[model samples]
Target: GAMAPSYRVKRMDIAKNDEECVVNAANPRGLPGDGVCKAVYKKWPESFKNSATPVGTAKTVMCGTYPVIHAVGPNFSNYTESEGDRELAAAYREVAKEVTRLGVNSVAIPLLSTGVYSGGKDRLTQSLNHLFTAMDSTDADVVIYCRDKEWEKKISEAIQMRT
Candidate 1:
């Protein structure tokens, strides 16, 4: 298997399915305009509305069975990489830790710090590699979702090249 040890992994369309919980690589300002963020907001606007929006280190928000784990990562330039990598690594670690604290049997995690975060494919790979490494000791089951097959393959490759 490509993903192992710490948690399970699968390839799927997280935005379309009704998983127990789905992770959102959210902006600190609580905007959900693109990628999985857009889908999440569309499905559960009431919870994501500006007044009631989850903001500033946004925690998990319930949208029935498909609860959202919002990870408000750092603000970095799209052209930047290393600094954002560190920021994303920390955020991803927290995300994995949060899943454990939530006591949920399973959760769907999207590629964080990418898409809206402007973290490119290389950055996404770096982020995932760092994320899985940091979360290697965590006790949570995760299914990593990506709508693009290319991205999914990259994620799988990252998992396969784990240390």
Candidate 2:
């Protein structure tokens, strides 16, 4: 039986001993950090060594054995959508390249502009597919790790698919 390539939608094991970068932790509270990382840094400073980096900015945060690539959402408080319609996609690629440059083998990302962008599901899906396809073909090991299952389920139900 043949299955769709991304059907399984793996749930990664978040590190108990390390930090995980989450969206909108820094600017909303006026600091450069992920929401998850901020809490971690507060409770366990040794765990969140990379909590000072900006949003949607990639850096090598520690895990059990290796550094993880942290990809984040754009700052939508000031800007209505993702920054620069064309620049968003371009910036993603640029970030992906940086992730590889930082010696991380894998990178994880949530749906970038869809949350704040003007375009609805269809448009965002198309943009995501395009950018992800390019990343996969380039052998970048792109990982689209999502947190918004409400949106995912809604979109999946609309098309009658699950992951």
Candidate 3:
């Protein structure tokens, strides 16, 4: 049998995660507007300066402790469910590729596009599905971090349902 990818869901700030890399749900223009992106920026302002990452793609910067993968997730407000799914999956795929490229042993990521980008419960489940699928391509241990207790519970439930 093939080796299954190792992953877990946790309630924590991605900025505080001790993984080799942390994925930031960033703006297309790479501005640290709010949410996880802003928090990550505050921790490593210089490393995250003035970069542009288009939606469905990612860029990496070496930070003080580890590298940060700035992943631009689609704004659901601007996309239909199908469009959002594709874009969000692509974004996660980019992050997986980056992890492989960096040869990182572990990575922590938040559910992209579910914050100010405008997504709800249904989107949360869909996002988790996309994230796990994309991340399967990488060998790194993955942690799906959620800042909210509710979301963390939901993510754990979703993972159980999927398994």
Candidate 4:
């Protein structure tokens, strides 16, 4: 299997990312509650309204500078590990599909469901595996953005091992 040529990890805020497309860790209802979703909402409030993005699926909206892919990742607090992992993987895949559909050159994505959704290290690993696998099919420049120092370190190490 071929790796995405420009895939890389970055320590930064996703809302401030200048990529041509951004992936949001959104809820099923697409509400702007907190974490990455809230930050994205702050940037494009109008684009997020009245969406019913399902778990394991994604929705896309055109922001001024870039398109926002709102991915509905699973909440581990409520779902079992197996269920969460499946949904998380599907969310990443859906986001990747949207990126391909939009024909974007560059994309920025955060670790979905790992923050307020309470998905821990296990879910983090699952996210990394599924994200890389999904993004590998696309030719876009993919950037995985992290805000927390601990997650940033973990993601960097994971990327090192995987790539």
For model 2, the run of ten residues with the poorest summed lDDT: 1-10
Per-residue accuracy of model 1 over 39-158 as CA lDDT, tens digit each: 778877554644222222436766664467777665555435666666667777667766777776667777666665653344566656766765666655667777667877777776
| Superior candidate under lDDT, 1 versus 2 | 1
Q: Write the per-residue lDDT of candidate 4 for residues 1-163, one digit (tens) a residue.
A: 1134576788877888978889988888878889888888998887686656889998998777578899898889888988888888899899988999998888899878878886454456777788997888788888898877787788888877765
| Candidate number that wins on TM-score, 1 or 4 | 4
What TM-score goes with each of the models?
Answer: 0.75, 0.49, 0.89, 0.90
RMSD of each: 4.1, 6.7, 2.6, 2.6
Better of 1 and 4 by lDDT: 4
Give the TM-score (vs. native) of candidate 1: 0.75
For model 2, residues 35-80, the per-residue Cα lDDT tens digits are 3434434543443454444544544445444444344434444444
Off by over 4 Å in 3: 1-5, 119-122, 161-163
Q: Comparing candidate 2 with candidate 4, which one achieves the higher lDDT?
A: 4
Best to worst by TM-score, what's the order?
Answer: 4, 3, 1, 2
TM-score of 3: 0.89
Enumerate residue pairs that collide in model 1.
Answer: none
Best candidate, TM-score-wise?
A: 4
